Amino acid sequence: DRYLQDKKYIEFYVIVDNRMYRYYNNDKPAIKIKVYEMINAVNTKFRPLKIHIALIGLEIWSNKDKFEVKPAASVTLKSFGEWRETVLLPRKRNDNAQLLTGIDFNGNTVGRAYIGSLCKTNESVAIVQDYNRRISLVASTITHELGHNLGIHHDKASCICIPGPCIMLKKRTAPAFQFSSCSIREYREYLLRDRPQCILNKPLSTDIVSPPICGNYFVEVGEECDCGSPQACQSACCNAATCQFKGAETECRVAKDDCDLPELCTGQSAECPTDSLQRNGHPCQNNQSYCYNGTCPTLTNQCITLLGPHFTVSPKGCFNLNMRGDDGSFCRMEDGTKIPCAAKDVKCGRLYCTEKNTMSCLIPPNPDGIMAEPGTKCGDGMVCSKGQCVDVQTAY
Numbered sequence: 287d288r289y290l291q292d293k294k295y296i297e298f299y300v301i302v303d304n305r306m307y308r309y310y311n312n313d314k315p316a317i318k319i320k321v322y323e324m325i326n327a328v329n330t331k332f333r334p335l336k337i338h339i340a341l342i343g344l345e346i347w348s349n350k351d352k353f354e355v356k357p358a359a360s361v362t363l364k365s366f367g368e369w370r371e372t373v374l375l376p377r378k379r380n381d382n383a384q385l386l387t388g389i390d391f392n393g394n395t396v397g398r399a400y401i402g403s404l405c406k407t408n409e410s411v412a413i414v415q416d417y418n419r420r421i422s423l424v425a426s427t428i429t430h431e432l433g434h435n436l437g438i439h440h441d442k443a444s445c446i447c448i449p450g451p452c453i454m455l456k457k458r459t460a461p462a463f464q465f466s467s468c469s470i471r472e473y474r475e476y477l478l479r480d481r482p483q484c485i486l487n488k489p490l491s492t493d494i495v496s497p498p499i500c501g502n503y504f505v506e507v508g509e510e511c512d513c514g515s516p517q518a519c520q521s522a523c524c525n526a527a528t529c530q531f532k533g534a535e536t537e538c539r540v541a542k543d544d545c546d547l548p549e550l551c552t553g554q555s556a557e558c559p560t561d562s563l564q565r566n567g568h569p570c571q572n573n574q575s576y577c578y579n580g581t582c583p584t585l586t587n588q589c590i591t592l593l594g595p596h597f598t599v600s601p602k603g604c605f606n607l608n609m610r611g612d613d614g615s616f617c618r619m620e621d622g623t624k625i626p627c628a629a630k631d632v633k634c635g636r637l638y639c640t641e642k643n644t645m646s647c648l649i650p651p652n653p654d655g656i657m658a659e660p661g662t663k664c665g666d667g668m669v670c671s672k673g674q675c676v677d678v679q680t681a682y
């Protein structure tokens with residue numbers, strides 16, 4: 287079962303601590319645009335994992351911190367977890383929170399996270415130092431720490447990735463863009479074993495506090511559809527560049543033949559409508575079929591497929607042999623044992639073929655052998671069904 291398979295979503299809450307606010311020269315606007323750009327970069331790295339980070343809360347501690355932030359990363363992480371559980375969570379629902387801090391952590395530590403703790407009330411939390419002007423680098427630490435919360439440990443010496451480092455390398459000095467196959471595996475297992483429920487619901491576009499981003503695969507305020515870039519877009523009825531529905535004149539799947547219906551964009555959805563077919567019983571090929579499962583079965587075409595372009599259905603009188611019910615000329619019951627045909631049913635029994643314009647009765651040699659296919663027209667307003675010649679409207 288899946289999971290696994292389904293697009294997942296994290297209702298993500300961010301705190302910018304008072305040290306970071308000071309380090310940003312008290313500039314809220316500059317702080318917010320930085321966090322927006324980092325979150326979008328985190329979503330780009332998480333995309334192959336089918337997990338989208340939806341920003342639904344941002345606090346900037348412009349006056350004072352709400353709990354004590356301390357340079358021992360493990361002590362802050364445990365304090366943040368507790369604050370999240372005891373203070374935030376009763377008032378603001380969220381799957382996971384990160385603290386972005388301007389404190390300088392002990393040693394060369396740049397963040398810390400609990401492992402595989404999505405949805406836990408005390409542990410779904412990570413801390414991250416804003417330790418470089420380059421979001422390319424802080425955003426990788428943000429993705430790496432969240433990587434830890436989603437059950438992934440550090441890459442062992444033998445993972446993977448080309449070119450730049452893997453996101454879960456314990457130590458990087460360049461931006462990281464992809465997870466190792468080993469990270470990908472461990473996450474897939476995390477999900478199977480812990481089955482974190484809270485990452486299954488899709489958040490409302492109106493609860494996202496980050497500005498809309500056209501091309502992030504999540505439909506936000508002022509967007510109708512979002513399928514990524516014009517070149518990646520697999521949605522036939524979305525104009526990727528503008529995140530807008532294509533118009534309803536736009537054909538998206540032409541009728542392949544006459545037992546087919548064309549699809550057009552609806553004008554108010556992103557995907558090409560599923561492939562509807564012409565209705566069963568519908569006349570086709572110049573009044574020669576019925577339609578059946580989007581196909582037009584005919585005795586002549588069955589002769590042609592069996593024996594080739596030089597043949598057609600035999601003249602009508604040949605089919606009367608089938609009233610014999612002997613070893614060559616017969617009908618079959620639904621189960622389907624050999625029976626003589628009733629007179630009305632003869633064209634639904636053994637098939638007879640002839641060379642074009644020649645009046646013979648021949649039988650394509652066949653161990654079974656061959657009878658009219660289901661829905662084959664056997665007379666006007668009639669088609670073969672369970673070895674019998676019957677009316678539309680059964681239909682079907």
Ligand SMILES: *[C@@H]1O[C@H](CO[C@@H]2O[C@@H](C)[C@@H](O)[C@@H](O)[C@@H]2O)[C@@H](O[C@@H]2O[C@H](CO)[C@@H](O)[C@H](O)[C@H]2NC(C)=O)[C@H](O)[C@H]1NC(C)=O
Pocket residue numbers: 364367406408409
């Ligand atoms: C945070 O989460 C759980 C604590 O949940 C506890 O579950 C009960 C056992 C009970 O004692 C509750 O009051 C607690 O809140 C800790 O992980 C463990 O969870 C399982 C399942 O309940 C249990 O078998 C373990 O013994 C729990 N650990 C304990 C009680 O020592 C987890 O370690 C906690 N981490 C922090 C930092 O609080």
Ligand SMILES: *[C@@H]1O[C@H](CO[C@H]2O[C@@H](C)[C@@H](O)[C@@H](O)[C@@H]2O)[C@@H](O[C@@H]2O[C@H](CO)[C@@H](O)[C@H](O)[C@H]2NC(C)=O)[C@H](O)[C@H]1NC(C)=O
Pocket residue numbers: 579580660
């Ligand atoms: C013609 O189709 C029907 C089922 O209707 C559609 O849906 C798909 C499952 C597929 O078969 C497609 O070609 C078709 O347009 C088949 O009839 C049976 O009906 C049930 C329920 O309606 C289906 O779930 C079954 O797959 C099928 N039963 C069995 C055991 O045969 C039908 O088989 C098919 N035409 C033939 C005879 O090949």
Ligand SMILES: [Ca+2]
Pocket residue numbers: 295296297380381484485486487
């Ligand atoms: Ca959720």
Ligand SMILES: [Ca+2]
Pocket residue numbers: 498499500501502503504505506509512
């Ligand atoms: Ca979007």
Ligand SMILES: [Ca+2]
Pocket residue numbers: 539540541546547548549560561562563
């Ligand atoms: Ca169609």
Ligand SMILES: [Zn+2]
Pocket residue numbers: 430434440456
């Ligand atoms: Zn790590």
